[PDB]
Design a protein around this ligand. Structure first.
Ligand SMILES: [Mg+2]
Length: 742
């Protein structure tokens, strides 16, 4: 019994190590501390100062160096008594100021305890090393245990959700968000691993197919970035389907915002999508030859970042893994071949060199790349050729071929590549769903694995999109926390800005940012300047959450939940329409490839609806929210410990900033205001009995006993509330209590 076996790995890796004794006395201490900023400039950097004296309204303390400093009781960040160091839930803390929250998290992380609850949230901090807590034996310990009966773990919230589903006969959701590198994907895979074990059968085909879908999507959707070697370049909502009996019966995946741009360009040190590298590494000498493949260095779309390999990863071996997953899900070798051929053609398309200066219109002298690409796509090179540099364009009733220059030509080519790529991804997702997805499903548990708020040096359309989704999600949480808190107070018999940001973005009348973008999108000749001027015109000094910059002519600010975000408007018009020359659709529509034809002939893949990329985004987000609203949700906040991808380096600034953005500190702020500590009567007595010359450690009349102690200590009754089963304490009270003499 691992949970009770102090020698188990359960104990070792998931719990604060327990010694012989539990006795209150052990933690007795005379010292009182405060959390302060040694450098008022650096507000997330604190140090602990021992309070030396006080006055009626201030405290005086001793800094790190022996420097006396003084502070206002009302501004003091008291440090919780040592007993509170390491608790499994931040809600168990008596003083809930920020530094206190950070400290508890750090104490845990220093013992490699990466999971901690904060009220409704599970906080998960990437340790940047592999903790062996996800084995099958680990899976087994969580089975059917209540939140309160086992240590914090992704498995634990996954079991709670599964039991809630079976118990309440209600669909569930797990929202796993945070920064790139935080471990969202990793935890999402633990959730699926867990559910397939606790609810799978014949332990099975279905289960292996479900498990095998990820690997497929990661290869086409993930890439090495400067922040994560296996970054998810798309967001996802996975629906895990169960029958009335609680057995897994299916799955469906919805994908969002794939970064198609990466296909054609990658920043220094970054890589293109894994798959490109997998193919080249792993294709068979005979496959290479038939696909006209070479090394990556020979491909414009793969030889620009300087990086083509990932430390400790075998593209060849992963390829194996990827083809294997495909086999298992059920992709026919033929299908597999066309996939690779599409990957191939894309690489060929990127190798096309456009030349000019004949006229002012582009040409192709060498036609090797083109032929290469046409061959693999199964399209007519001459048609491809014309469609690239001489697309026929509607100007009046006049349908006329325009000779584009090398640039436009190049950009068009890039558009083609992006379309193929995104359409292929979409088709792979549908293919997967077909195999996995249930028409008739009884229940589901869905997992969202998407980033939280994004605030980079440069914020663009995709950033607004993701932050727009995050305002919606933060508002969902806030509505939820609010219902739950009330219920609680109710069961124990104890006595917005979101909307405004949301409206500025998605409002229809008056029109918000996306509506004005859609409007401009209809005018072929609109520009970045017309757009941004229109935005400023409607919101500058007119909408409280918008800000026109003092100098930049190309950006605008939005006050988000997480703070102000500055956006740059370049290419939004283009991003919004995501254009592709009709002649290009025509060309490929004739492909002789059984997969390619689908990318262009199926209106479900080839087209958005004519609705804009913003309108589609807004639509998909609303459906998503509609689905979530039907579930009982569970929130996991994944946090990166620093920006360097290193273990054992938990950076206060880095962390605190995330806690600020993701809603964890707000929640505590709100919680701290009422009765943050709610404890089961017996639990209380068991620990504090010895503070009153009355009480029996054990005692049927636990509430009475509680009242004994309280009374004995002369506690201010405004400080607590007797609930039906727990005693409710205001912030700080419990700390003073812990501090009482036996
Ligand atoms: Mg990820």
């Amino acid at each position: 019994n691992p949970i009770h076996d102090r020698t188990s790995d359960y104990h070792k890796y998931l719990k604060v190590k327990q010694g012989d004794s539990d006795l209150f006395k052990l933690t007795v201490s005379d010292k009182r501390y405060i959390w302060y900023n040694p450098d008022p400039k650096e507000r997330d950097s604190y140090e602990c100062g021992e309070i030396v004296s006080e006055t009626s309204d201030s405290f005086t303390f001793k800094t790190v160096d022996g420097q006396d400093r003084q502070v206002k009781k009302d501004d003091a960040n008291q440090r919780n008594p040592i007993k509170f160091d390491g608790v499994e839930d931040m809600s168990e803390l008596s003083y809930l100021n920020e530094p206190a929250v950070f400290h508890n998290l750090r104490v845990r992380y220093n013992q490699d305890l990466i999971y901690t609850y904060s009220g409704l949230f599970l906080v998960a901090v990437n340790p940047f090393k592999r903790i062996p807590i996800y084995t099958q034996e680990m899976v087994d310990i969580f089975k059917g245990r209540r939140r309160n009966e086992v240590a914090p773990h992704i498995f634990a919230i996954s079991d709670v959700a599964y039991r809630s589903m079976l118990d309440d006969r209600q669909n569930q959701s797990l929202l796993i968000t945070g920064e790139s590198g935080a471990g969202k994907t990793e935890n999402t895979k633990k959730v699926i691993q867990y559910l397939a074990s606790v609810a799978g059968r014949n332990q099975g085909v279905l289960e292996q197919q479900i498990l095998q879908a990820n690997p497929i999507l990661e290869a086409f959707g993930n890439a090495k970035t400067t922040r994560n070697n296996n970054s998810s370049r798309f967001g996802k909502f996975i629906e895990i389907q169960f029958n009335n009996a609680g057995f897994i019966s299916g799955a469906s995946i919805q994908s969002y915002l794939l970064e198609k741009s990466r296909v054609v360009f990658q920043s220094e040190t970054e890589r293109n999508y894994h798959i490109f590298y997998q193919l080249l590494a792993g294709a068979t000498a005979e496959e290479k030859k038939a696909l006209h493949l070479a090394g990556p260095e020979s491909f414009n779309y793969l030889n620009q970042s300087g990086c083509v390999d990932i430390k400790g990863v075998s593209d060849s071996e992963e390829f194996k893994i990827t083809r294997q997953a495909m086999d298992i899900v059920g992709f026919s070798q033929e299908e597999q071949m066309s996939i690779f051929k599409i990957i191939a053609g894309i690489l060929h398309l990127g190798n096309i060199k456009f030349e000019k200066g004949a006229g002012e219109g582009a040409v192709l002298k060498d036609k090797t790349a083109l032929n290469a690409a046409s061959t693999v796509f199964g399209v007519n090179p001459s048609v491809l050729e014309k469609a690239l540099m001489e697309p026929r364009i509607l100007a009046g009733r006049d349908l006329v071929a325009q000779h584009l220059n090398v640039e436009k030509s190049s950009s068009s080519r890039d558009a083609l590549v992006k379309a193929l790529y995104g359409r292929l991804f979409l088709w792979l997702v549908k293919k997967i769903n077909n195999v996995l997805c249930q028409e008739r499903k009884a229940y589901f548990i869905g997992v969202l694995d998407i980033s939280g708020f994004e605030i980079f040096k440069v914020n663009s359309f995709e950033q607004l999109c993701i932050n727009y989704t995050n305002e919606k999600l933060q508002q969902f949480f806030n509505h939820h926390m609010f219902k739950l808190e009330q219920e609680e107070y109710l069961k124990e018999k104890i006595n917005l800005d979101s909307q405004a940001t949301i409206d500025l973005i998605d409002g229809r009348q008056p029109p918000g940012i996306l509506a004005l973008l859609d409007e401009q999108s209809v005018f072929p000749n609109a520009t970045d300047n017309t757009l941004i001027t229109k935005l400023h015109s409607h919101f500058s000094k007119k909408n409280a959450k918008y800000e026109e910059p003092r100098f930049s002519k190309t950006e605008f600010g939005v006050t988000h939940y997480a703070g102000q975000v500055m956006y740059e408007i370049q290419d939004w018009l283009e991003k919004n329409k995501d254009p592709l020359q009709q002649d290009l659709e025509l060309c490929f529509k004739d492909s002789s490839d059984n997969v390619v034809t689908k990318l262009f002939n199926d209106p479900n893949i080839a087209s958005r609806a004519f609705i804009t990329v913003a309108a589609q985004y807004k639509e998909q987000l609303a459906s998503l929210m509609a689905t979530l609203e039907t579930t009982n949700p569970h929130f996991v906040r994944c946090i990166i410990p620093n920006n360097k991808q290193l273990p054992a380096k938990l950076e206060d600034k880095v962390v605190l900033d995330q806690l600020r953005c993701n809603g964890v500190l707000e929640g505590i702020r709100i919680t701290r205001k009422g009765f943050p500590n709610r404890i089961i009567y017996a639990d209380f007595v068991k620990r504090y009995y010895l503070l009153a010359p009355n009480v029996p450690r054990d005692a049927e009349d636990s509430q009475k006993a509680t009242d004994a102690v309280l009374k004995h200590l002369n506690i201010d009754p405004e400080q607590y509330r007797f609930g039906i089963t727990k005693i409710f304490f205001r912030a700080g009270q419990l700390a003073r209590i812990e501090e009482a003499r036996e």
